[PDB]
Amino acid sequence: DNDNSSARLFERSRIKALADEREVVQKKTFTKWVNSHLARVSCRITDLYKDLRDGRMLIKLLEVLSGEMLPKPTKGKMRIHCLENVDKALQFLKEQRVHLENMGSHDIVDGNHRLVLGLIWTIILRFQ
Amino acid sequence: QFVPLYTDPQEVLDMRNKIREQNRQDVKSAGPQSQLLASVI
Amino acid sequence: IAALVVDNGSGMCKAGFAGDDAPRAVFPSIVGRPRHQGVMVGMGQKDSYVGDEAQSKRGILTLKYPIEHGIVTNWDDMEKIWHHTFYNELRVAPEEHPVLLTEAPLNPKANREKMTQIMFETFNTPAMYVAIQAVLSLYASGRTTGIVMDSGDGVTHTVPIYEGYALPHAILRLDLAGRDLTDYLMKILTERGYSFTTTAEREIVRDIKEKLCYVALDFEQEMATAASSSSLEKSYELPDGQVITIGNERFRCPEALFQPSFLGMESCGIHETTFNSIMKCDVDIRKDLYANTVLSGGTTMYPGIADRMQKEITALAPSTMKIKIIAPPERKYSVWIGGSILASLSTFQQMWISKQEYDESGPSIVHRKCF
Amino acid sequence: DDDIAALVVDNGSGMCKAGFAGDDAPRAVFPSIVGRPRHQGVMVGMGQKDSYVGDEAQSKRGILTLKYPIEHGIVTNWDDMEKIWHHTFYNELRVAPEEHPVLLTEAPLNPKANREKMTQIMFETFNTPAMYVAIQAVLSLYASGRTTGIVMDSGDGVTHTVPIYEGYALPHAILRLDLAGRDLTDYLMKILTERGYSFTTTAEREIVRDIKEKLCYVALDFEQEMATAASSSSLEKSYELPDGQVITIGNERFRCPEALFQPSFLGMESCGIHETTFNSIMKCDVDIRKDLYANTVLSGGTTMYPGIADRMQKEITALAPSTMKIKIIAPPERKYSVWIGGSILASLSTFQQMWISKQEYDESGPSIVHRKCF
């Protein structure tokens, strides 16, 4: 088990760190990029994972970037209404030839870090 | 024909020693960033 | 800019940047699709689940493997793994970086040509290269001469390397995978009274095999001790909360590696395959080959495999010969590490397949550019 | 030795069959159920009967709850199995168990404790001089009379495919599927709800089984038959309940057995029986496959649906390469075939060497069964 212990230590040290500084850098960079465009409608985000759960912030970001006007989000605070808002945002992204896989409403709502970061990166890279 | 004619195995050994030294030190360093994201900062 | 190293064996995918010690992303190579009808209006719409996100919701998916025995059976799925690797995990632009890919020794040429065509046409990579895994294992090990046996989920292969040269004579490719061991483990767990049929239950059986297995030094005393007493018994908790006891089978599933007669195959064991690959080489180089045996791959992570391999090779080898078995504690990722080293050499930058060279030569450039 | 004939007992999940060696047909065939009363008992002087087993458990099923001792080929309750064996030996055949040896059949892939407990029960209580345990699908090939072939046995508990070439069986190509007529009866009971008929008790399950055995068939083309059933009413048939009520099964007749070929109707992820047979064929070596293509043998009571052979042949032909010739061998006596094979195995002069003696059991405990048999 000593060999397995050394291997497990390698897993929980090296790969953890080599990911972890990368997403904590990219989170700040993406937050700055989104907040710069979102200043025109006078809306700020202070944490990337919490603010994208409602789906209205992503709708406003696509509102600023796209140039035309998206459908209304549902005026409700339930989980299913958040799923509606995120699904509407993903539908609008799908209509503009943007390729997304392993992307769903429940993934954004539940707060998966790497999938939210991948969605933001795809919007940055392909839409602008 | 695959390997270049003039090369050093000691170069490969020194290179893997340089990588393993950084593994031992465990210095934190982020990955490369795109130039498009370099523009926004 | 630093290149990308993408190790793609069957079952798991590893990805990272060049010049780094460890890969950034490690995730299984599974693509699942929902089989049950959805009745709740307003949920998320997902046609396919890729990678680790697929393995969380195993209860409503039919798991499938795009790579079988080192061969990509489904290319549309392989595109999904590659795209999820590039955009969701690494979140890097594919056209900004060159990429490095790994494969088994003996494969059809159509696999190499299709990887080159997909890697150039779809992702618009500026450069790419295809490297053999087992040679990269020796770069990770740190010796210019030795024989390496890479056994992973999908494939097992032995190659000897002398002075950085890969001898095509003694390359042996055995189709004794860890997935075959998982299927044998299911078949022998049927005897105790436990039945696993679905692919999610196959993943549970794989977790059982990884957590609770070992290789005995001698099989007969282990069987006699298992029959005599109940000291060699362990318990495992299923995801539904049911406790199962394995007992005898813990040293029976990996023993199929050394004796393939349990699985019904005709090929010899891994020790005999390594010995035969050693015998195929020249007489005067057998010294370094016997003294520098290297183990690699996730299949060789069972406890006690190194001592058993040393004993089995020593029995076959001449008595005057020194036998040494090298097993690094981090050998499972060693292949990727070798690739990173090969990606960071100054003289390797001359070896990249440029985009315009591919435009001139077609997909057949890969055969003349890389080994 | 000459006049003494070993008893042959076929023991499936649904029904139990028993007879003497050297006979073409079993003497006693009866369902394997054990029923117990549930209501009040108010008439004094009628006598006390704690348990009902066998055919006369079926006759008084109105006031009984019915339990199956064998589920999916596994003996869950052993006391009821002892009841069934005692009723077989004494009431049905009227033979002393000490006089003759006993031959038993079982599924290929079963837990070890089932075999050990079978050996322990047949030596310790019934006191038999010898006993042997064999596989049902192997005995089906004995009944067929050919050296080579692939046997697909489908009973009430389990379906299994074994290939045999030149008297040699391949253990790695043996396939087991937990999809039998038991689940088909449950599926028919589920799909009869949408026409307004409700069967819930264990007594009504026998009525549903009778409806399945009388008014079911396998369509050669599923979609065309569904279109025909939607277009016209010529496919409808009428059945009479024991209380005189009349029901019309209609569309369901070809939908209940269709779950054999498409298990997704039951929520199962497994493949169909045709795909299971094809996969069992391709798990063997290259050379024998042609012979395994030419001698596919059907067996068991589940394969008694009309039109099963044509659909199976069509599906296998679609899966197999076109240059091979595919035929399906289904004798009219395929419900009893296993038992016939047992008798053929029990009367051989060579097989007298292979009996498990009582002295060997006394020396080796119940673990002797794995070393012998198969």
Ligand SMILES: Nc1ncnc2c1ncn2[C@@H]1O[C@H](COP(=O)(O)OP(=O)(O)O)[C@@H](O)[C@H]1O
């Ligand atoms: N800790 C462990 N102990 C024993 N076996 C393991 C362990 N981890 C993984 N394996 C086996 O190794 C296989 C993974 O091999 P891997 O090195 O990922 O192959 P590749 O990288 O070529 O895809 C798994 O299928 C599993 O059966």
Ligand SMILES: Nc1ncnc2c1ncn2[C@@H]1O[C@H](COP(=O)(O)OP(=O)(O)O)[C@@H](O)[C@H]1O
């Ligand atoms: N004539 C028939 N037509 C269609 N199906 C039948 C017929 N007779 C029996 N069956 C099915 O077969 C089952 C009985 O199978 P059986 O031969 O008793 O299996 P085993 O003997 O292996 O237990 C019944 O439950 C029923 O579903």
